[PDB]
């Protein structure tokens, strides 16, 4: 069983753009998420909303995020918080100009890597590998997380989380533009709706208005 969803915000750029239309494969036997899977779930804070993010932390993982390099660190089996197993190989490629630019006043634009937009900032694209599964992420170079607003886990140092059983840690590929687990905690197994497997339609559009055209080129699988 599948279910189509529309992508209104840019929290998953560049992997998923605003105006995209995705196909979600219901988890439900009811399979579980795999580290790196794009998952759609009920937003804990407000279950009336469906959120889409990447499952970076599975039950037992010790997640650490460096606000400066903006890189993840995962250590599986850190269940009982014991001197858990080796660090999951999390590899990053060299930062490079992405194909979009964020403007302020609020707004994203696919722009030729040589151009610049007034009151805008070229976002940095780069690849991240969560074990064996590789995907891209964007970063705004003039921004950095304010650890203060981070959700702090009872007994955990700031910017570090030990995922509880039957819980997951979610993060958006548009790393400096994503209200994810870094701010509101974990997601329970029950809230998980499914895995996003493909884009079936895509309209070049700025959130809040109608389409500027099509992007048939994006129809295909994602990961």
């Amino acid at each position: 069983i599948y279910e189509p969803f529309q992508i209104p915000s840019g929290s998953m750029m560049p992997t998923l753009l605003i105006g995209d239309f995705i196909l979600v494969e219901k988890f439900a036997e009811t399979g579980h998420p795999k580290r790196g899977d794009i998952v759609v779930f009920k937003y804990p804070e407000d279950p009336k909303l469906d959120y889409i993010k990447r499952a970076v932390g599975l039950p037992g993982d010790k997640v650490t995020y460096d606000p400066v390099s903006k890189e993840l660190t995962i250590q599986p089996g850190c269940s009982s918080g014991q001197a858990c197993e080796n660090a999951l190989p999390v590899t990053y490629s060299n930062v490079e100009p992405s194909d979009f630019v964020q403007t302020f006043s609020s707004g994203f634009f696919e722009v030729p890597k040589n151009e610049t937009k007034e009151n805008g900032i070229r976002l940095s694209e780069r690849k991240e590998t969560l074990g064996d599964v590789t995907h891209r992420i964007l970063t705004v170079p003039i921004a950095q997380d304010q650890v203060g607003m981070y959700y702090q886990q009872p007994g955990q140092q700031l910017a570090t989380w030990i995922v509880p059983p039957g819980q997951y840690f979610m993060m958006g590929d548009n790393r400096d533009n994503s209200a994810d687990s870094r701010y509101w905690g974990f997601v329970p197994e029950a809230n998980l709706v499914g895995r996003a497997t493909a884009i079936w339609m895509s309209f070049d559009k700025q959130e809040g208005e109608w389409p500027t055209g099509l992007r048939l080129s994006r129809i295909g699988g994602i990961h």
Binding site: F5, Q6, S9, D50, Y51, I52, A179
Partner: peptide, 6 residues
């Protein structure tokens, strides 16, 4: 279906 996913 349809609908959004933030």
């Amino acid at each position: 279906x349809x609908g959004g996913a933030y």
